[PDB]
Design a protein around this nucleic acid. Structure first.
Ligand SMILES: Nc1ncnc2c1ncn2[C@@H]1O[C@H](COP(=O)(O)OP(=O)(O)O)[C@@H](O)[C@H]1O
Ligand SMILES: Nc1ncnc2c1ncn2[C@@H]1O[C@H](COP(=O)(O)OP(=O)(O)O)[C@@H](O)[C@H]1O
Ligand code: BEF
Ligand code: BEF
Lengths: 198, 221, 266, 170, 384, 152
DNA sequence: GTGTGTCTCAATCGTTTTACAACGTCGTGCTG
């Protein structure tokens, strides 16, 4: 599926590091006790999830690299997806996403198109992704997650995989729009009756 | 309304001759060089560039309100102030003000925004060893012909030596890192073109270094 | 010089960086080395930040260079050595009042939590440097060693941290009366030093000393009229004179605060 | 006005479609869970039951009957196994994208780890997996292996092929 | 001395009267998953009286098939086998007991605490998947933990109540003198003189009350600070040598460092005990963006540092090696091997064969499918 | 197919819901509603789900609102205008006939490393797994040390 | 063949809402 990733300036990743076009089947990562695995998965979650949102000054500084080389200002992660039709803009066979972060700026993007956040949120939402804490991702030692949570949350996850939350949200929003139109329509009717008289 | 007026006069008259009759009005906009609005700051920097292009004789007393904008938080003021320093550098001839251009350029080699660290190099490149004339190709330095020794390379050469003479260990390192970063240019042709200019320089100084074997204490150093 | 040059090898990747970036930015196509320095500073730290206050300028300037490197690479816990940066912020020659402010404004930009209350500790150091016995009467007007401290923190909407540090200065301003008979001249000389450091500093707002005057009138009310029938009565003790002189230093300041901005009425 | 009444019809039909989709997806995920869990252990029953609302994961580690074995009183290993069975069944019903696993080998045994390895082989046939461990059972199934190393205050990634299954297990 | 026996009937997944045998120094629980292998730590925690919520269950009828009890026997270095038995009576109440005499909690906790076993703040225990969250919680609760080891909580209650008494007296007296300066400032009429006399006497009364309260406050603060300073002083001088003993592998003969700092040296209860650590090849970062393995090592070093102050008779470890490689599990195995003596009894649960492969006694746990009774056996590692 | 091409009005309303309210002026506002409803009521494009139907419903109601607002404005203007090893151990035991104690099953098993350490502990973990799945009944509480009898 | 005049991409300066962290309120679980 997804092919290759580049990370630079991220935590414990100073320079220009690329990973090979990995295999579509099972992949494993092995290394030392405390090096570069949790950071790798945190970068993958950083580019595509709902996390690191309510950040602050020391937060948007906590995820850079602090070293003796030179003071680093910005960092960026970029992934490469080899989709077929799962993502809606099928005109692009190799979609690419990236999120750069400085000390006082962040920008989502598409294939060098620097769009805002709401559009990439809507893009990932039309695809088969989930905005909030995703079940297909498990962080360090957090595997005993969806076996001890309150069972209403399990109903919530099941309604999530069936895709209904956004449906209810947009339905309510549409109802609000309908109320605005019903008032405007009453106005229209009174004014045109005045027209008709005159 | 204060934004609009100074925005309008930036192109309104097309003649700074109004300030030939109103130097107190010019003194008005000099005061607003430190306004909080980042928008009005650049306007002052644009107007003051235009005033030098025609009414040239105000190089010294204007110069102060120019470099005072390079050390500012906004990027627009910095990306604009730099380009005005370009034009001023050629029209001016006092080497003592030329060095003040350079020290304020090299200090901004690195910045919070990436583009400031981008523009600051080529605007330096354009000055030091990339002249815009003829006879700059396929030759070396020769003996006092076409008056290139005291009329062409004296802007390519002179402001160097007085900038690299600072014994401060900051200067000797801030330069040498910048030079290597300048080498990795945009790669249309990246090595041979820059070579030809500096191979001339490296032979040009060398001709003045051949003066050391045809000759003085500080000059050699 | 050997120590600084040793540490400089890790920092020489500033243009040896580009010597390597000529193979990194433009690519080509025992493991103790990283951990010799980061230990041999902590075994010899307590002399390093003691040398910085000497009069031998070459000795001092070549000490502050080491301190400039250690915090920049983070080899020793900055918490242990942050209480000496403020003591180098003002009480020296002009040639070092830059770098101290630079480190003091670097940590407060991106760390903000490892250093937030330590001012209360570090202010004991500055008073521990200069001697005051029958001499050097702390008359108002001198350069308060926190003149820049409030400036560096106030470069935002700091409705909280601006309040935090002044709390760390007023800690002996109120008289807790840790033991009401026992206070020594140097102990009340301490609080008099804390008076002037609050005095000579300008502010961006006006509200923050209005609670300070609210505190000093409490000690004026609470413990003042206790000693009022003591000084006037045969004065044959040092319990009160070590305090009543300190207590009457408060009306000095409070009078200076009514003229600190000439806006408070009473 | 005609446009208004047509969109009202649209809201009604979409609500009906939502409800039938919820029902069928619950049934399918329940069946998938039961199948995967009975496949994992030589003898056991697993099933999900929705409560009376529109969930309770009645697990049992034996074949004959349960002894009201309340969840989060069983063990760490059993509930880790239950969580993995849940996510793997959800993905079996509908293929999810690029799932990622960080140290699932936490409190399992040999046999459970082997059974995990075989079923994740099949799930790798159907979808995209990336994972991290230290043990010899998960390693034998990826057919595409990597490796990281930390030197000079930077972490680098590489690509290796055979030495790791003997170097970082034994 | 040490733990010697455990006889328990009808505990959770233990039907019948089972007897858990000899517990030498550094014993290892072992068995397949999902069958015994930590109900033993649970039964130990239940004898050492604790709330059920820290255990896996959430009530007291849910540990059985009739009413049950756990009885522990302990040695006091002088031959006396003192037994502590805790039962579960019907309807859900409970009855504590020492040496087959019914005794309320008071003397239970007292005569238990006299052997350096602090149960109000359990420290000798650790639960499955909680080793790494011992060095990552906020600094206030680390100060709370070390203060519970100090045993000064009544001091905390008198402290904060007296602080409330004392801000109340001082602010009331402040507004009081404000109104006095107000009223008397206009004097140049009976109104002002009544205001004078009554307000002066009111303020003198508030002053006497404030002075008394200041005395009471100074007393409680002096006692609390004596205890806290004793504890912190003795602990914060001992963590760096043992941390360097933990992290100095043959690969890195300069192990690393660890620091415990605080903000106000005189008033420490305000800012919690900040704690930081440095692995061998690493710069200074806080305990948030550190990884799992160093978190585990730091937490174990912290617990051993606690042990350096007041020695506990035993120490129960669950799966402490969840996220570790081979190097440092071999290191901690060597530490535990060469540190256990007459004062310490390490009872460790783990699966990695390398870890428990060099114990002294093993307790293996099986599960006969006939009764669903997770029965167990035990064996020595001395004849081999 | 509204995602791919620009044939149907379903593509236009999808743009309206997906991008923003803008980039759809009055000249392209006047589209059809009934066609959009009969395109959404049938099965959607390559993603068979409901999320896209929800977005389409938001788009059609937004277009509805904007057209109604434009009608209101025009009517107001018109009014204005008209106003004018567990196997290896299982094997050794499977062969050996009852009775057998642990000490003797260990005696006939010598681990390749020669240590009475890892061999014994692996033997122990083994007999534990075997007893865990209905191999052996064992007995040890007879107050005799190392007295486990092992029998199928 | 050279200046034209129109269309499309980037910073910045008020709002806005929205996530977040402090604070009473209950309700279950015990122990005397
Ligand atoms: N902001 C950072 N900048 C640089 N290095 C970091 C930063 N935060 C954490 N690290 C280092 O990253 C490493 C974490 O690697 P991880 O993948 O977390 O180890 P594990 O192998 O246990 O998963 C540690 O050395 C940690 O100190
Ligand atoms: N009250 C009870 N009665 C009978 N069995 C129980 C009871 N409570 C828990 N159990 C079972 O006891 C077993 C717990 O064994 P434990 O020792 O907790 O497993 P681990 O090996 O992870 O430590 C589980 O099967 C659990 O369901
Ligand atoms: F819950 Be036990 F530790 F396996
Ligand atoms: F080793 Be990582 F933190 F899982």
């Amino acid at each position: 599926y997804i092919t290759k990733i580049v990370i630079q300036g991220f935590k414990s990743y100073k320079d220009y590091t690329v990973i090979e076009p990995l295999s579509p089947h099972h992949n494993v990562i092995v290394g030392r006790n405390g090096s570069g695995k949790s950071n790798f998965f945190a970068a993958i979650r950083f580019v595509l999830s709902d996390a690191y949102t309510h950040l602050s000054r020391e937060e948007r500084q906590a995820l850079l690299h602090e070293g003796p080389g030179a003071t680093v200002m910005s960092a960026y992660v970029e992934v490469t997806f080899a989709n077929a039709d799962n993502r809606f803009p099928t005109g692009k066979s190799e979609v690419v996403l990236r999120r750069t972060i400085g000390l006082k700026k962040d920008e989502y993007s598409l294939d060098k198109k620097t769009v805002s956040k709401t559009e990439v949120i809507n893009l990932l939402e039309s695809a088969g992704f989930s905005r909030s804490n995703p079940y297909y991702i498990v962080p360090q030692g957090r595997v005993t997650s969806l076996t001890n949570a309150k069972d209403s949350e399990r109903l919530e996850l099941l309604k999530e995989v069936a895709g209904t939350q956004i449906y209810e949200n947009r339905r309510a929003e549409s109802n609000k729009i309908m109320d605005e139109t019903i008032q405007k329509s009453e106005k229209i009717d009174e004014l045109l009756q005045y027209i008709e008289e005159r | 309304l204060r934004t609009k007026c100074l925005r309008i006069i930036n192109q309104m008259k097309t003649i700074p001759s109004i300030l030939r009759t109103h130097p107190e009005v010019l003194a008005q906009i000099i005061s607003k060089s430190n306004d909080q609005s980042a928008i009005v700051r650049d306007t002052v920097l644009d107007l003051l560039g235009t005033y030098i292009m025609a009414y040239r004789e105000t190089i010294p007393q204007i110069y102060g309100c120019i470099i005072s904008g390079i050390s500012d938080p906004s990027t627009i003021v910095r990306k604009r102030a730099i380009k005005q320093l370009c034009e001023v550098y050629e029209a001016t001839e006092d080497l003592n003000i030329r060095v003040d251009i350079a020290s304020k350029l090299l200090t901004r080699s690195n910045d919070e925004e990436e583009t400031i660290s981008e523009l600051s190099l080529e605007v330096l490149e354009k000055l030091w060893f990339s002249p815009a004339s003829n006879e700059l190709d396929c030759q070396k330095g020769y003996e006092q012909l076409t008056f290139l020794e005291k009329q062409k390379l004296r802007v390519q050469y002179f402001p160097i030596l007085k900038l690299c003479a600072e014994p401060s260990t900051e200067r000797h390192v801030l330069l040498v890192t910048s030079l290597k970063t300048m080498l990795t240019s945009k790669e249309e042709i990246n090595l041979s073109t820059l070579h030809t200019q500096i191979r001339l320089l490296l032979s040009c100084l060398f001709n003045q270094l051949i003066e050391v074997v045809t000759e003085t204490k500080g000059i050699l150093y | 010089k050997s120590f600084l040059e040793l540490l400089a090898a890790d920092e020489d990747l500033i243009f040896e960086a580009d010597q390597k970036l000529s193979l990194k930015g433009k690519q080509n196509v025992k493991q103790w080395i990283e951990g010799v320095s980061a230990s041999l500073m902590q075994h010899f730290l307590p002399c390093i930040l003691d040398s910085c206050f000497s009069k031998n300028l070459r000795y001092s300037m070549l000490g502050i260079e080491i301190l400039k490197c250690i915090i920049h690479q983070g080899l020793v816990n900055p918490r242990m050595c942050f209480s000496t940066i403020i003591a180098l912020e003002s009480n020296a020659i002009k040639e070092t009042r830059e770098v101290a402010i630079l480190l003091h404004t670097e940590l407060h930009r991106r760390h903000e939590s490892l250093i937030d209350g330590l001012y209360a500790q570090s202010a004991d150091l500055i008073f521990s440097l200069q001697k005051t016995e029958e001499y050097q009467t702390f008359k108002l007007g001198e350069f308060s060693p926190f003149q820049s401290a409030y400036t560096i923190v106030s470069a935002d909407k700091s409705s909280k941290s601006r309040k935090k540090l002044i709390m760390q200065i007023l800690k002996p301003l109120k008289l807790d009366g840790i033991d009401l008979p026992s206070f020594t001249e140097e102990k009340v000389s301490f609080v008099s030093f804390c008076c002037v450091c609050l005095a000579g500093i300008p502010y961006v707002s006006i509200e923050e000393p209005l609670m300070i005057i609210s505190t000093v009138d409490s000690v004026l009310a609470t413990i003042g009229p206790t000693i009022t029938g003591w000084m006037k009565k045969l004065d044959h003790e040092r319990f009160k004179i070590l305090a009543g002189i300190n207590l009457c230093n408060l009306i000095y300041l409070k009078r200076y605060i009514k003229y600190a901005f000439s806006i408070s009425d009473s | 006005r005609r446009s208004q009444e047509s969109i009202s019809e649209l809201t009604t039909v979409l609500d009906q479609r939502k409800d039938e989709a919820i029902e069928r997806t619950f049934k399918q995920v329940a069946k998938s869970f039961s199948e995967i869990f009975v496949k994992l252990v030589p003898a056991g029953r697993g099933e999900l039951v929705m409560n009376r609302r529109s969930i309770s994961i009645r697990v049992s580690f034996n074949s004959k009957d349960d002894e009201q074995l309340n969840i989060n009183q069983l063990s760490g290993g059993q509930k880790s196994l239950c969580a993995l069975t849940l996510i793997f069944a959800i993905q079996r019903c509908d293929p999810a994208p690029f799932n990622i696993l960080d140290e699932c080998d936490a409190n399992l045994d040999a046999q459970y780890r082997s059974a995990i390895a075989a079923m994740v082989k099949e799930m790798s046939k159907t979808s995209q997996f990336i994972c991290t461990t230290f043990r010899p059972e998960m390693v034998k199934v990826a057919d595409n292996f990597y490796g990281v190393m930390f030197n000079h205050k930077v972490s680098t990634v590489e690509s290796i092929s055979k030495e790791e299954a003997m170097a970082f297990v034994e | 001395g040490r733990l010697l026996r455990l006889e328990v009937e009808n505990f959770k997944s233990y039907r019948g009267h089972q007897i858990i045998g000899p517990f030498e120094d550094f014993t290892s629980i072992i068995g397949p998953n999902g069958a015994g292998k930590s109900n033993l730590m649970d039964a130990i925690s239940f004898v050492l009286g604790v709330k059920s919520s820290h255990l896996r269950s959430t009530n007291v009828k849910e540990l059985i098939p009739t009413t049950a009890y756990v009885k522990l026997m302990y040695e006091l270095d002088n031959g006396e086998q003192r037994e502590y038995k805790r039962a579960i009576t019907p309807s859900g109440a409970t009855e504590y007991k020492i040496d087959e005499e019914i005794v309320t909690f008071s003397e239970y906790c007292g005569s238990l605490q006299k052997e350096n076993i602090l149960v109000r703040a359990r420290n000798f225990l650790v639960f499955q998947g909680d080793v790494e969250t011992i060095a990552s919680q906020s600094p206030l609760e680390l100060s709370k933990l070390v203060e519970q080891i100090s045993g000064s909580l009544e001091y905390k209650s008198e402290y904060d109540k007296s602080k409330d008494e004392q801000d109340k007296a001082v602010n009331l007296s402040a507004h009081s003198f404000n109104k006095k300066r107000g009223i008397n400032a206009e004097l140049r009429l009976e109104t002002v003189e009544t205001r004078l006399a009554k307000l002066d006497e009111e303020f003198a009364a508030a002053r006497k009350a404030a002075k008394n309260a200041k005395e009471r406050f100074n007393a409680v603060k002096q006692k609390r600070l004596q205890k806290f300073q004793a504890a912190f002083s003795h602990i914060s001088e001992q963590i760096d040598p043992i941390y360097k003993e933990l992290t100095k592998s043959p690969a890195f003969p300069l192990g690393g460092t660890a620091y415990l700092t605080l903000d106000d040296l005189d008033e420490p209860y305000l800012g919690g005990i900040k704690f930081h650590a440095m692995p061998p090849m690493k710069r200074f970062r806080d305990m948030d963006q550190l990884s799992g393995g160093e978190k585990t090592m730091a937490a174990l070093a912290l617990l051993f540092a606690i042990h350096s102050y007041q020695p506990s008779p035993f120490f129960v470890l669950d799966e402490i090696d969840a996220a570790l490689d081979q190097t440092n599990v071999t290191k901690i195995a060597n530490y535990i091997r060469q540190h256990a003596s007459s004062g310490f009894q390490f009872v460790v649960i783990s699966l990695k064969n390398q870890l428990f492969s060099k114990s002294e006694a093993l307790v293996g746990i099986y599960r006969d499918q006939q009764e669903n009774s997770s029965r167990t056996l035990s064996i020595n590692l001395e004849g081999y | 197919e509204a995602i791919l091409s620009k044939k149907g009005p379903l593509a236009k309303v999808w743009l309206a819901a997906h991008w923003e309210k803008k980039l759809s002026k009055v000249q392209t506002l006047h589209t059809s509603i009934e066609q959009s409803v009969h395109a959404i009521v049938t099965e959607e494009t390559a993603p068979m789900a409901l999320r896209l139907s929800g977005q389409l419903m938001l788009g059609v109601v937004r277009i509805y609102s904007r057209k109604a607002r434009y009608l209101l404005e025009d009517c107001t203007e018109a009014l204005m205008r008209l106003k004018m090893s567990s196997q290896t151990a299982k094997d050794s035991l499977r062969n050996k006939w009852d009775p057998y104690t642990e000490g003797e099953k260990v005696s006939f098993q010598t681990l390749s490393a020669g240590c009475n350490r890892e061999e014994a502990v692996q033997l122990f973990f083994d007999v534990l797994v075997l007893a865990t799945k209905d191999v052996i009944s064992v007995k040890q509480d007879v107050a005799i040390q190392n007295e486990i009898t092992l029998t199928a």
